[PDB]
Amino acid sequence: DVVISDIEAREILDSRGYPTLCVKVITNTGTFGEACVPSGASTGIKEALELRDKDPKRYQGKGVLQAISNVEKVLVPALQGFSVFDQITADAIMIDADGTPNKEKLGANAILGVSLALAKAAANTLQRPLYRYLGGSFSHVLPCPMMNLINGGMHATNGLQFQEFMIRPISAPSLKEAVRMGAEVFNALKKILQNRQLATGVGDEGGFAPNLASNAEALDLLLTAIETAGFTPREDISLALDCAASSFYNTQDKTYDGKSYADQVGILAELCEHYPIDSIEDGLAEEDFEGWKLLSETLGDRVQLVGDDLFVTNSALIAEGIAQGLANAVLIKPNQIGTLTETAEAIRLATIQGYATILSHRSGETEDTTIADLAVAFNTGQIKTGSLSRSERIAKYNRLMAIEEEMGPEALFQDSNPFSKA
Amino acid sequence: DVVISDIEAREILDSRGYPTLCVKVITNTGTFGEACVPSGASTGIKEALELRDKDPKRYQGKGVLQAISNVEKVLVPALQGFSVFDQITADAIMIDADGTPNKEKLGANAILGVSLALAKAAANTLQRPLYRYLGGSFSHVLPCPMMNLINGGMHATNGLQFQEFMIRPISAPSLKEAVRMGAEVFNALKKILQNRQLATGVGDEGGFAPNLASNAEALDLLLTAIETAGFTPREDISLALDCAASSFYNTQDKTYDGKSYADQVGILAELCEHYPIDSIEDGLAEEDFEGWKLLSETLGDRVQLVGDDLFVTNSALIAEGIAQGLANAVLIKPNQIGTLTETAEAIRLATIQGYATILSHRSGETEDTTIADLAVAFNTGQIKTGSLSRSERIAKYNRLMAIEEEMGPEALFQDSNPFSKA
Numbered sequence: 001d002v003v004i005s006d007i008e009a010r011e012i013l014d015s016r017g018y019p020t021l022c023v024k025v026i027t028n029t030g031t032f033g034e035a036c037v038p039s040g041a042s043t044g045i046k047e048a049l050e051l052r053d054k055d056p057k058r059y060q061g062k063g064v065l066q067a068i069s070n071v072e073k074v075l076v077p078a079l080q081g082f083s084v085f086d087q088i089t090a091d092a093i094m095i096d097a098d099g100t101p102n103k104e105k106l107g108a109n110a111i112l113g114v115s116l117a118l119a120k121a122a123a124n125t126l127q128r129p130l131y132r133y134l135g136g137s138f139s140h141v142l143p144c145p146m147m148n149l150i151n152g153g154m155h156a157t158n159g160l161q162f163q164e165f166m167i168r169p170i171s172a173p174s175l176k177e178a179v180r181m182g183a184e185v186f187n188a189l190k191k192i193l194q195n196r197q198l199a200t201g202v203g204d205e206g207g208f209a210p211n212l213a214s215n216a217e218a219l220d221l222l223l224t225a226i227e228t229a230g231f232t233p234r235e236d237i238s239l240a241l242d243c244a245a246s247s248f249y250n251t252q253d254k255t256y257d258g259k260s261y262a263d264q265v266g267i268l269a270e271l272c273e274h275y276p277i278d279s280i281e282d283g284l285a286e287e288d289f290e291g292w293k294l295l296s297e298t299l300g301d302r303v304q305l306v307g308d309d310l311f312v313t314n315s316a317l318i319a320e321g322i323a324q325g326l327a328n329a330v331l332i333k334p335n336q337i338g339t340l341t342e343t344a345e346a347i348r349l350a351t352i353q354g355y356a357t358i359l360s361h362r363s364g365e366t367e368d369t370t371i372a373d374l375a376v377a378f379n380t381g382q383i384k385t386g387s388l389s390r391s392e393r394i395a396k397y398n399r400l401m402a403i404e405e406e407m408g409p410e411a412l413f414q415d416s417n418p419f420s421k422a
Numbered sequence: 423d424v425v426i427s428d429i430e431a432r433e434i435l436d437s438r439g440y441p442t443l444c445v446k447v448i449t450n451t452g453t454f455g456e457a458c459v460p461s462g463a464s465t466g467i468k469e470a471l472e473l474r475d476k477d478p479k480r481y482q483g484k485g486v487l488q489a490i491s492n493v494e495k496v497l498v499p500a501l502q503g504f505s506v507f508d509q510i511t512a513d514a515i516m517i518d519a520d521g522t523p524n525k526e527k528l529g530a531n532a533i534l535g536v537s538l539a540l541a542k543a544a545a546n547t548l549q550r551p552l553y554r555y556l557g558g559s560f561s562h563v564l565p566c567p568m569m570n571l572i573n574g575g576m577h578a579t580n581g582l583q584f585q586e587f588m589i590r591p592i593s594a595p596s597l598k599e600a601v602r603m604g605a606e607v608f609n610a611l612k613k614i615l616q617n618r619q620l621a622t623g624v625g626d627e628g629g630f631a632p633n634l635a636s637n638a639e640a641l642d643l644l645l646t647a648i649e650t651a652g653f654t655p656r657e658d659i660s661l662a663l664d665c666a667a668s669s670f671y672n673t674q675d676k677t678y679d680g681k682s683y684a685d686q687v688g689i690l691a692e693l694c695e696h697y698p699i700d701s702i703e704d705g706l707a708e709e710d711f712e713g714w715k716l717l718s719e720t721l722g723d724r725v726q727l728v729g730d731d732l733f734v735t736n737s738a739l740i741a742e743g744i745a746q747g748l749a750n751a752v753l754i755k756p757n758q759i760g761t762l763t764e765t766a767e768a769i770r771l772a773t774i775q776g777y778a779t780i781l782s783h784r785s786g787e788t789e790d791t792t793i794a795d796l797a798v799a800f801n802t803g804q805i806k807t808g809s810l811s812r813s814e815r816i817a818k819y820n821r822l823m824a825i826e827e828e829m830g831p832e833a834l835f836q837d838s839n840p841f842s843k844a
């Protein structure tokens with residue numbers, strides 16, 4: 001039997017230049033797996049706790065030496081000798097060792113580092129693909145990506161209200177071709193921006209961050225780039241939004257930059273009337289029940305409505321929201337909950353209720369590509385992992401292309417958005 | 423007797439969203455190594471040929487299917503059965519198979535992909551660190567980085583004349599501390615720019631790309647960021663430039679945006695008098711003999727003078743330039759010449775003449791981290807691998823920190839710039 005022998009953890013930087021951890025789980029046979037932990041910027045209030053050192057003289061308080069210490073001093077003795085293959089058991093051990101609902105004692109970043117690295121150690125021990133180890137023999141669906149080509153909100157300093165302006169290459173016959181379509185639209189957009197004397201520096205997720213007059217102008221630019229690249233909007237490539245509305249929600253006044261939730265739903269409904277948008281993420285704030293209810297009644301039968309901060313990849317919140325008729329899709333961010341076991345259960349509970357799930361990066365990413373394998377492992381049919389620049393995004397597309405090529409005739413590229421324009 | 427059994431190649435995207443290759447060399451025992459190939463923007467005219475497909479309907483003609491085909495159909499038969507450890511032999515076989523000085527038949531990108539992946543396959547077969555396999559048992563010097571925090575030239579569309587404005591954290595006692603210092607300055611600079619209503623979108627190498635009035639303004643901003651992070655300019659952190667002067671050299675009349683080579687040397691001398699610059703790369707254009715001679719006579723005993731396009735990692739040009747008294751350091755970019763064997767010889771010929779060498783990324787990078795191992799393998803003492811955002815840069819810093827920790831008490835962090843401000 002192959003068991004956990006040691007766990008190493010080290011401080012690296014993420015794609016924004018902030019500390020995070022890389023964790024390596026080592027077995028008694030010398031096999032190992034290694035994973036790094038991402039970090040959000042527009043973090044939901046109910047996300048599991050990312051533990052930072054708060055040393056003001058070191059990385060402006062953002063070190064993760066304490067989380068690393070917790071891996072080495074607490075999680076190692078708790079996990080040594082347990083089977084590398086008993087993923088659920090190990091995740092339960094770490095949850096119990098922390099003992100708090102939001103993983104505040106040890107840190108969700110410490111625990112997730114181990115959780116991801118453990119699964120890789122087990123797959124590497126078997127010499128099997130991670131997506132097959134995690135998802136079984138019938139993991140075979142490549143996800144349709146939503147690609148964030150213009151960045152705003154907390155991912156830039158351009159004053160753009162919405163956070164993410166995305167394209168979805170829904171007519172692609174393969175993931176490899178979806179990547180090409182997105183890359184050709186992205187670089188057509190760069191030239192369009194340059195000719196308009198607009199900035200081509202990229203924001204945190206690799207999309208351009210120009211100063212624009214409105215959310216609509218960003219959607220206009222995406223349409224122009226789609227057509228300039230030779231594709232047909234709606235037919236070949238549709239549009240998607242992450243408003244990340246909690247970022248501009250005044251909880252005291254209950255206003256979205258001055259707008260009531262009714263006004264904000266009307267704004268979103270108008271955008272869907274005029275643009276080929278087939279998905280809207282976090283259109284209302286994380287705890288605005290009346291707003292989400294009205295959004296779901298208004299658009300929930302015609303557009304994908306993605307809860308991100310609404311659900312924070314949390315099985316209990318997902319069940320609660322589904323029971324209340326809120327949204328129809330769930331963004332899946334493993335570090336919002338802190339273990340792969342809880343990530344899998346969030347996917348399972350949403351899926352059996354007819355909700356789509358979308359594996360997602362964070363705005364602070366690493367060279368880790370685990371979410372590519374996760375999207376295929378669970379046959380989710382959708383992924384959100386960034387623009388077509390910056391290799392903390394590109395590496396996931398490269399990994400998806402490798403998975404697709406490896407599977408050969410087993411692979412199926414298929415969008416799971418039932419409201420797709422195709 | 424472990425020999426080459428197969429070579430796979432696949433098309434991925436680089437950090438700019440353009441195609442490149444990743445190559446996997448497989449031995450008869452099943453061990454393997456994999457490497458990806460970077461791509462420059464401000465490419466010297468004497469660089470070995472990057473082979474592109476030129477199909478206008480696919481990635482705007484930038485596919486690398488032909489280079490991949492050359493790996494699979496030409497380099498596989500030429501290399502099958504040769505020892506995985508005979509690196510010089512394999513590189514010579516590939517050079518002979520192409521048969522042209524600049525690797526124009528098969529592509530320097532096809533050849534380098536194999537060259538890098540082969541060395542990794544050999545190191546992986548021995549279960550030894552790549553830097554020890556390549557450099558031997560006394561590879562132990564960690565490089566002082568020069569970190570490109572404000573991007574201009576061909577790496578941005580901001581109209582900034584010089585290409586790279588860098589800091590060097592010369593008071594760091596370790597590479598991991600150099601990384602911290604750079605990250606703290608970078609994120610201080612982000613707030614400074616935002617408070618000045620300047621853009622914080624990043625250029626190709628992860629440095630900010632605001633619209634500035636002059637090269638001097640970018641240097642002023644670096645100084646302000648160093649001071650704002652609580653570091654002392656000159657003592658803790660010095661400055662460096664890559665002018666990439668070929669990018670603004672008019673070959674019709676041999677001037678630098680209108681200035682003579684003597685004017686341009688005078689401009690650089692004045693910058694060195696007013697700013698704590700201890701290194702200037704490609705201050706004159708790649709074939710400007712009189713300019714480089716005057717620069718070397720004027721500043722060559724006071725500041726590091728780095729030839730990049732001047733030498734294109736080419737042993738014969740390095741020997742000739744040294745014989746002419748030009749520059750005092752060489753930038754080392756493996757894909758400018760196309761094999762590791764020729765990369766190592768470029769380093770050797772420069773080093774024995776007292777020139778420093780600096781391992782370098784390209785502006786189009788990947789998740790590959792080979793240049794981190796190369797900088798340590800050859801004890802170069804200096805590396806140039808980007809700003810503190812975008813993980814195609816950060817991954818090299820992470821790899822260097824891993825190497826440093828792995829070596830324990832063997833590690834020595836040491837700047838090889840003999841003109842350093844400290």
Ligand SMILES: [Cl-]
Binds near residue numbers: 631
């Ligand atoms: Cl600006």
Ligand SMILES: [Mg+2]
Binds near residue numbers: 040
């Ligand atoms: Mg968010």
Ligand SMILES: [Mg+2]
Binds near residue numbers: 242244281282308309
């Ligand atoms: Mg979101």
Ligand SMILES: [Mg+2]
Binds near residue numbers: 666
């Ligand atoms: Mg260049």
Ligand SMILES: [Mg+2]
Binds near residue numbers: 463464465
């Ligand atoms: Mg060129």
Ligand SMILES: [Mg+2]
Binds near residue numbers: 664703704730731
């Ligand atoms: Mg250069």
